[PDB]
């Protein structure tokens, strides 16, 4: 019984023992690829280990980055948090400026902007652009064949029964794959908190645009006089709104004679809704902020003020030293 245990143990032990020394020696001479410092990104990655990203090895995020040969968001499994962590190892990311969605600046739907002729070919926007630019009356409007839907990877665009695309705000993640795929340069990126957008891209004069479409821009310039914060400009016979200076006063919406500016009149009208706790009866708002809308006597707490005037810009919400005024949107509907 002694030999039957001694011989196999000895043979297998010798075989195992020589191979360990052989592999330890083979660690040298052969592969010495340690020269990229590995322990950079091996914990922020959730871990899938699949060959659908490049990166020959899921721990290869140590030589793929320091040369700019790989994209920051090359890992879809890791997502925004993992990409932000990887970038903030070097910096750049972990920033600000909220989130954006995709919008269509056009509102002509197969009945207000009809077709000049009939088009034969493939049902695609670029294929239609081959056939002399399309068969629509307006040379700047939506063709309606849905290239942007075909290029969207997250399934956020659906083509409505009226011909214009609709974007789901919960499935769209702030990319531009549908922006450079539009032949008409119509798809654009807009902040999710914005509700006042000029929806037209027509660069013709008044009479031709009036003949072409029902809700066209005629470059009358009446929307610039109403605005006082210098946020909307008329250039190339078309109006455009700057979103960095727009206070959403809803003043230009009612003045457009052709209904090109989006939004409904439900806004503001809250002149000095002041919380009684943290105001010292300063009375600095009684004098003037460009409209009067406050006039009273000292205004000891609680404030006695009638609310039937003012435009609701929002400057009086941050210029106070204590910020005792509260902004609440309360109107009809």
């Amino acid at each position: 019984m002694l030999n039957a245990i001694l011989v196999p143990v000895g043979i297998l032990g010798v075989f195992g023992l020589i191979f360990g020394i052989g592999l330890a020696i083979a660690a040298k001479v052969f592969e010495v690829y340690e020269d990229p410092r590995v322990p950079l990104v091996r914990a922020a990655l959730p871990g899938a280990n699949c060959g659908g990203c490049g990166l020959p090895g899921c721990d290869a995020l140590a030589a793929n980055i320091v040369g700019g040969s790989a994209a920051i968001d090359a890992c879809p499994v890791g997502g925004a948090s993992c990409a932000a962590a990887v970038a903030e190892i070097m910096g750049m990311e972990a920033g600000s400026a909220v989130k954006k969605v995709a919008t269509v600046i056009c509102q002509g739907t197969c009945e207000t902007a009809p077709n000049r002729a009939e088009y034969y070919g493939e049902m695609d926007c670029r294929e239609a652009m081959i056939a002399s630019g399309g068969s629509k009356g307006c040379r700047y409007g939506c063709l309606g064949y849905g290239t942007c839907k075909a290029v969207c990877p997250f399934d956020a665009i659906v083509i409505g029964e009226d011909g214009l695309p609709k974007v789901d705000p919960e499935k769209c993640t702030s990319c531009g794959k549908c922006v450079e795929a539009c032949p008409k340069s119509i798809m654009t990126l807009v902040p999710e908190a914005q509700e006042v957008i000029v929806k037209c891209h027509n660069f013709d004069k008044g009479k031709i645009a009036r003949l072409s479409c029902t809700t066209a821009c005629i470059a009358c310039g009446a929307c610039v006089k109403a605005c006082r914060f210098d946020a909307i400009t008329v250039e190339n016979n078309c109006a455009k709104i700057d979103y960095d200076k727009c206070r959403q006063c809803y003043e230009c919406v009612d003045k457009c004679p052709m209904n090109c500016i989006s939004g409904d009149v439900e806004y503001g009208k809250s002149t000095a809704y002041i919380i009684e706790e943290n105001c010292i009866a300063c009375g600095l708002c009684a004098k003037n902020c460009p409209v009067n809308a406050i006039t009273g006597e000292i205004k000891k707490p609680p404030y006695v003020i009638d609310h039937d005037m003012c435009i609701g810009c929002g400057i009086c919400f941050d210029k106070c030293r204590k910020s005792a005024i509260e902004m609440r949107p309360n109107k009809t509907k």
Binding site: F30, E31, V32, Y33, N49, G51, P56
Partner: peptide
Amino acid sequence: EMIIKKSSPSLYQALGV
């Protein structure tokens, strides 16, 4: 595995397991 990754191209490690 030791000899392939060093001298033969590193882009060939796309087999993935």
